[PDB]
Structure 1
Amino acid sequence: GSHMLEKHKLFISGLPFSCTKEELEEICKAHGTVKDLRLVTNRAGKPKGLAYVEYENESQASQAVMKMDGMTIKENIIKVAISN
């Protein structure tokens, strides 16, 4: 009958202290299409290098994670892994 597609989220951390949501969003589109992006921050409105971003599909995120693993950002090394 009717079925709802299953979404997936990527675990990204280790981003620079100068990295913002706009910068990260730009990166996601490079590997695919950023459909959902959220930046972990407190009520103070302080952005943080730890956040999650869901991909339109599973294949896109899968091919993106392999190529994005070890990606150098501002001379820094970030870690990316798939969730469930």
Structure 2
Amino acid sequence: GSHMVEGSESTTPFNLFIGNLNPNKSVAELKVAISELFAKNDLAVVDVRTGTNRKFGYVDFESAEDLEKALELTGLKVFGNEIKLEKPKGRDSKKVRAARTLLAKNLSFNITEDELKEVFEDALEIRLVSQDGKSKGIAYIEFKSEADAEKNLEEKQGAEIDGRSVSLYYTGEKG
């Protein structure tokens, strides 16, 4: 579909983000499962997208009544994958935030975002990196900017905790 509209960058006033789509299915299949469930729910999905690779995804409604039901619609099993839902975070092109972000490495099974939040008081967001279902030892951390994530990343780099030092791996192309 090569059609665009005005207002800003959306097809409707009520939109939303979803997670857990289906990496073993199709994109239209993910949106159709949510479009069919809304047809039975009594909604009116105006549009739906995906979370690149069917990992997460998006949706769009035509009213505040579809957005409120769309909230309760977080119990959607996309082709057998209970998708998650919540306000959209459209800001950086997913791989764009990495520039102003840095992830910690060499962490442990006990450490956590809280501990990173205690060491990275300047970082605004953090994302623990495990093995898709099992603590791995890394933790992403985004700051107010590159110089911010860089000044803190270098300012700590190591943080003696859990009887172990946590390294910090930025997120760019040159690293």
Structure 2 length as normaliser, TM-score? Answer: 0.37
**Aligned counterpart, 1:80:** 168
In structure 2, runs of 5+ residues without a counterpart are 1-90
For residues 2-37 of structure 1, the C-alpha deviation after alignment (integer angstroms, 9 at most, x for no partner) is: xx88632202111122112222222211xx1x3222
For residues 14-73 of structure 1, the C-alpha deviation after alignment (integer angstroms, 9 at most, x for no partner) is: 1122112222222211xx1x322222354x5x5442121111112211111112123211
**Aligned counterpart, 1:26:** 118
Instruction: Indicate the RMSD between aligned Cα atoms, in angstroms.
Output: 2.4
CA distance in 2, matches of 1:47, 1:40: 7
CA distance in 2, matches of 1:23, 1:70: 13
8 Å CA contact retained: 1:20, 1:47: no
CA distance in 1, matches of 2:169, 2:127: 16
Q: Between the two proteins, what is the percent identity of the paired residues?
A: 26
Q: Which has the higher contact order (CA 8 A, sep 6+)?
A: 1
**Aligned counterpart, 1:64:** 152
**Aligned counterpart, 2:33:** none
Larger Cα-atom Rg: 2
CA distance in 2, matches of 1:83, 1:16: 20
CA distance in 1, matches of 2:136, 2:113: 9
8 Å CA contact retained: 2:101, 2:146: no
In structure 1, runs of 5+ residues without a counterpart are none
Provide runs of 4+ in structure 1 moved above 3 Å: 4-7
**Aligned counterpart, 2:125:** 36
